[PDB]
């Protein structure tokens, strides 16, 4: 058991005597305010730190931390900058460790500089008691483990005031944002399941899927590979189109519009919720500028430049970063290409007889996720080094610059395969007359029969489900806390949820139940992070924070990019604008009977390109006279044959017109939602006005 | 001459005795603070109001107005909430009249309610001295008339601190914004004149204008009127295309991009300038909420509803307003249509022999401007009534709602003819096979030969120049100020400049010297408004104000709409995308030789529609065999004749693709400029931090 100390530091028991002097210079400056009690162990010794009530309100008034009054309006205890009450335990251990860390950070030799120097191994506050203990007397860590961090309490709300009071406003704000996100993902998931079930209802009776799954037509297609494979009927690969109707029905456009409205509504809902929490925790915004101490490399840089005495390297850093982002785009493209070219020769040596082309795609996206998870650490280390060579002035700007660089690298190498599949997958391959060969050897890529919307959708499925299946498959208190994992930070746990929000808002236009997978991951993730923070981590030092920070701007930017990416998905990969163009220009019946016959373009088989015909052209049981590819081109019985016809330009013009009207109308709807939903809630504004007039009443009397 | 009073009210000398009692109840409540001296005249009597130094710092401390200290950092007098100095004239007449108006507004029977009741005719402060006077002793009104309001001082900067100190922060902020706008219109005008001179340089050697002005081709066009007029060569109406190259060269696209960057830069420049002025005038932002008194109809409404006791009429008001805006769109369209159909029969009865089709267009746009200037008052009165029937709660929300409604009505009926000409002018008329007749009588409209870009450009010219040519073509001080014009408000003078900014930013894509006309109007308008405020108006009561208000949001919205309207202009009316499509798809030479032959589509003359041929088809001196219209259609020697060809869909697809890439890239550039240019200037942030640390130094010692 510990006695009632607040912070705790770790020595290194045994340059060496220079290190001992660098130690002893610090607490001899600390006894000016804070007591000490050096602990004892077997190999490496440790030291304690008890605050004194002489110095407690001195620092508690040095920075105004709004503590509770004695008078209360309408059963709610009012709060003021510093207050007076007996029973000297009204400073909880969170605030006590915050004060002692303020003294540890202000007292020079702060503590972070010598901690990076390596004279102290660790400096951490103490966990209140221990969870699952034998008759522990109302422990806050135990109460949080029982009511918040268990897995069988996933349905319940989370005690956000108690997790704030125990872990600090930063951890409380992360869990409040995660709770608001998982709560806003409920109507998203409901409408997504409704849309998917409507697709399942109309699969059996939509016409352009019956046109593909209908036999007795015998539509012979072109091989879509150079020399290995051969011709194939459109009647065979029709389960792909039958399942693609689930993902490109006319309700998924409604779900795209609804998801942009949902993203704007969630932005406003979290803004109002964090204003409410800033009311409930710290109404005052006295976190002023130029109070944070500069970096030690910043101090060395300014001392060196004033000694030997800067306007070009500060932008050369960003130039290097933009070159790295472009290289990361190209590297993600080629890593996905060699990933889908790695899972090959599946039928010769194993001969498992898949005959679904879903096993090979799942293997491709799984090993692509493996290589991306390997490159994540490299990109993070590169961003850290690339900020450390810039040496920013303050720690806030250092964290924000490192966060933005690591987010751009994670964004790029996480959404590059999906952007590649969704947009630039099978466009720039030519007709069967002349294919576009890259590096003169082999054709570029033709995406899977029935469209590569299905490839995109099962890629999103395997990503949003594999990020869950990879995990699913008597001692003293100070040394017990030493044996835990040090608290790294909230930046990767912010980053994973921002990447998931990007997945949802960017590709609901093709995957209408991405909010369902995100909600089923977040329900587990809230309790997993809760169990981690309670059991496996040292106590975070609990620094105050007003909002999330740069992550809200990142969220708003991803929500802005979601509109244009959804527009481009619905137009250029959903096969939804060709159906409207058929129905409203080339119908002659009012219905889309013959849409597949209008989409597929004929091809005289004798016009190949230097023996690129399949070596066995008899696989369908007959010699083929005309294969039918899919490119909106002129027939071979024409004056201008195989060139682009009028229908390609008509469909393309309608696609771009839909991008224009979708982007404009949906961005205006998002701006209108953000403008109608008010920034300041009525209850919070009325309560702060009432509290301020009651405070000036109390100070006038 | 007056003695040293501060405000001044006007009685009504003669229900009647009830009106006299309603008078006398007010100053008998005013002598609690402020002295009075009832004046004397011949017909209607007046009353004065001298403040007292007993009550002067009492109200000057009731609201903190930051007055100057005695200590100064770096030759700049520091300021604090209220200060102490002898020589009791350090409250200027502006602040003195502000204090007396605060008392007049707070003392019940405020003054505005009884002024609307009609018991006082006028309540105005007094002008310091008089301009152009015989040996006046350093008068501030005279100094402003000599250094700011003269016409021969147009080149000089304006004394913005002195016009603030004499007229209030609202008038100072209007003139500061107008000065920042006219100063930002200098590089705009320079680059616009450079673009126009580049067009004048390349007129003589561009190819598709030589193809039109070249004779010996004898391209016979179609009459573009139903029965009256006849065929005409493209060689005749080629001055129009020769002058249209000035307005649709490839440099005007650069000017559109530069004007969007200029609008974003001007937004950030004014934001920084008004933060600088808010530093220099009132650093404190204590203009709190719920301090403004409610409306008297609002008080009557709440009293009535509590007596007889609202969730539907508050939105029915906006429904009525949106119906009025749609009706105003349709009314502007039909007013411009009957305006261009009014100037007719010019050759029969007058027989002036114009032969330019610029006189009739100038007459059409002039009488359209006349009818729009008549409808402006109707729309303003309708917006005022439509807000008064809503009865908003506070005066700030009343002014903002009335301002937004009057701005939407002015926006609609000011930009409807130009939107109609630029976009929906000659699109929805058919081919010469079947024209689209409206109301079964006459064809819709075919815009002028050589494109109606020229009609749009001379319409913008006549608007932005006619708004300047319509104007270019011993007594006592209290009664002298009574004989002036009462200060109405800054709302129409804001509105005119916002409409001009809309003209500039929305149609620089076709008119590359609209900033030149706006600058030449603003140079006159600054000194005209200065001369008005100095000489012709009563002294405004000088209420403080932080920023412009809703006009900045209106400016930012117009700057956002400018991007998409410029994209649609450059694509769909500039004839710039057909030239790129020709040059990069149908060239066979690398140059655009034959662009007019590719644009014009043939037409067999014998296929008209029920005798809609011209009755004299021999005006060109020969019987015409094929007329050539301009619609990108198939020739009459075809299997599918007169229907839309492949080139129409190709050009339309490229047009929409240019709208997409222009809107996206240019909106990202505007967001990047707004994000790079910082909100808080370095000098102002450093000076407020230095002033605050010096203030806490002075109050700690």
Author numbering:
A (entry chain B), B (entry chain A): 117 to 130, 165 to 259, 267 to 466, 488 to 651, 683 to 910
Study text:
Calcium-activated chloride channels (CACC) facilitate transmembrane anion conduction in response to the increase of the intracellular Ca2+ concentration. Structures of both functional branches have revealed the general architecture of the family. These proteins form homodimers with subunits containing ten membrane-spanning segments.
The structure at 3.3 Å provides a detailed view of a constitutively active mutant in a ligand-free state. Whereas the mutant resembles WT in the Ca2+-bound state, the Ca2+-free structure of I551A exhibits pronounced differences compared to the corresponding structure of WT. Compared to the Ca2+-free wild-type structure where the intracellular part of α6 has moved towards α4, in I551A it moved outwards by about 30° in a direction away from α4, resembling a conformation that was also found for the Ca2+-free state of the lipid scramblase TMEM16F14. As for WT, the π-helical region of α6 located below the gating hinge Gly 644 found in the Ca2+-bound state has also relaxed towards a canonical α-helix in I551A, despite the difference in the conformation of α6 between the apo structures. The observed differences between the Ca2+-free structures of WT and I551A emphasize the functional interaction between the gate region and the intracellular half of α6 in TMEM16A. The relative stabilization of the open state in the mutant enables α6 to adopt a seemingly more activated conformation (with partially straightened helix α6), in part overcoming the electrostatic repulsion at the vacant Ca2+ binding site. Thus, it is conceivable that the observed structure displays features relevant to the mutant’s basal activity where, even in the absence of Ca2+, the movement of α6 couples to the narrow neck to stabilize a conductive state of the channel. Importantly, these observations suggest that pore opening can proceed without the transition of α6 into a straightened π-helix conformation.
